[PDB]
Amino acid sequence: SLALSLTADQMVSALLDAEPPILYSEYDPTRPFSEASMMGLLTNLADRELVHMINWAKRVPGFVDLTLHDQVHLLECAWLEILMIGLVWRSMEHPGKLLFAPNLLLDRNQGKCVEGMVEIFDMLLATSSRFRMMNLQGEEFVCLKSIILLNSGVYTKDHIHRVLDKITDTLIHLMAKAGLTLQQQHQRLAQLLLILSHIRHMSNKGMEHLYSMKCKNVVPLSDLLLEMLDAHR
Amino acid sequence: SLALSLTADQMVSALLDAEPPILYSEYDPTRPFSEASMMGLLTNLADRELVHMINWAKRVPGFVDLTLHDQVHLLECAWLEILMIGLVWRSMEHPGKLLFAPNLLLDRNQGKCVEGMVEIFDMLLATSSRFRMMNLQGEEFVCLKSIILLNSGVYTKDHIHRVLDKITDTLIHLMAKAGLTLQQQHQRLAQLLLILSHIRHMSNKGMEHLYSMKCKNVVPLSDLLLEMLDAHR
């Protein structure tokens, strides 16, 4: 293996480089906000991001060393969590609103355009704020992302489990390097990993929402997103 | 506060004593396994356990010091996760099957009596095995439970957040006391907290299943469970 020989500095540099490109949304201000139009907007953005998510994943160390079946599984499991953790990262410096994209800064009422939305929004916000409040650093963040990708799902895979314990060591290395004591170190480690739970949860609630929107047949969804959803029931 | 003056040994002793009583299921072998009857069985057990879950929670250090509104919220959020982590603890020494109760040892095919069940079962099993495989100790387990109770939900609560960092220190103290190195310590800490994610997920999938069973109107559910469910949509 190669992902294991990498020092933390190397590990972090790799993940930092594998970052997906920032995307504009299809927002257009000549057409007003309807439930249909905003869901189409968010849903279009999601399809876009998914295409880059795939090629981002491959660049995550050791990921491309798994059987293609497992690479698929991890992504069918993780895509919305990944999507979310990104949104929540992207929104940290905007108390009150969600920075879906450079041209899409939504805030809480804009969400209750779409029935079911506002509840998930409230959580995405809460989580966002929590990261800002504990000063999450870009270097921790890319680690989180990866853990999220690698940790999604179940057992029937000890490969996956080593490259995770790697990422953990990297995490711990950052804090050490950032001037924490041993006890503050483990404490903050725990604090971040507990947050991952909230995202699983937000992810689950979203996925169901997205599914109810597909049926109601508000907006049509693109072939790829469509697959990532159906992968879940 | 008082939950903060407690040394780890004290903290662990408290949680170890607050344990709920073990319950028999209403299993009866004169009546054969139907989808109706097994769901009624599991669903009856759940209502039972919930009554003890309430009084168990109060005994969890610092829990009874929160506003009643928050005590309620944590439980509406956590009940199935709590239920599950317990099942998964209880099943560790039974490769292959789920020890719902002293008189109810189900295994995987028994679950595909009920449509939707088998998928959740498979995960409960996977998680169970994972704990057995890393030799989860009773002392770690009660900590996990509590974290699960305390960590459920969202922000709008720094009280909650201290008594969690307490539980973390306790956790870390156990490992230290059990002969791990610093690096094995943080690694195992991370491994357990990552598992909590899988439970959030199993919890979400179950809750939806349980809800679909209420509508289909297979089995009737008791007033209390009924509330814990409706608390979710």
Added chain:
Amino acid sequence: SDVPTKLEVVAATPTSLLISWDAPAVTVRYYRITYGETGGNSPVQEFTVPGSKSTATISGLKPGVDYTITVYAVTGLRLMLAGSKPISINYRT
């Protein structure tokens, strides 16, 4: 009061117990009764009684043994939380 009180054993055979308590002044959805051999440590049995009732029989007990009986008032999450520790008693059959 506001939670069950004055729990006690009314009658008894070698194998059965009839118990009663003073109900709380409140809609009670139903009660749960649990019993187990005292300090035997095993799993306890449990059964349900409609909330309009305020007595219950317990049967199939081992003669001459000491049981712990506990009556749970099932109301709602909030009351149950706010509420007091449930009342229990010991009775040897």
Added chain:
Amino acid sequence: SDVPTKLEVVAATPTSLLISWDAPAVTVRYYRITYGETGGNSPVQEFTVPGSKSTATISGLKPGVDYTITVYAVTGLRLMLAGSKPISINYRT
């Protein structure tokens, strides 16, 4: 081949680019085209083209600037994973 190849700029105005590529030998659900000013570092634009097509115009570019263009073949999760790094090019308008 099995993923798009031979991407290139066919025609160009100060503000528009017309591009083409050799399609892969496969059902392609659709393509994504992304473009951005080269090493400008900003967010890139992106738009979709039906999979039966194999050319696209890009408009509203700043004259005389250097863009990076990349064509993504959207198939399925499995192929896309198995598939190779997407082909890209640089063209100054």
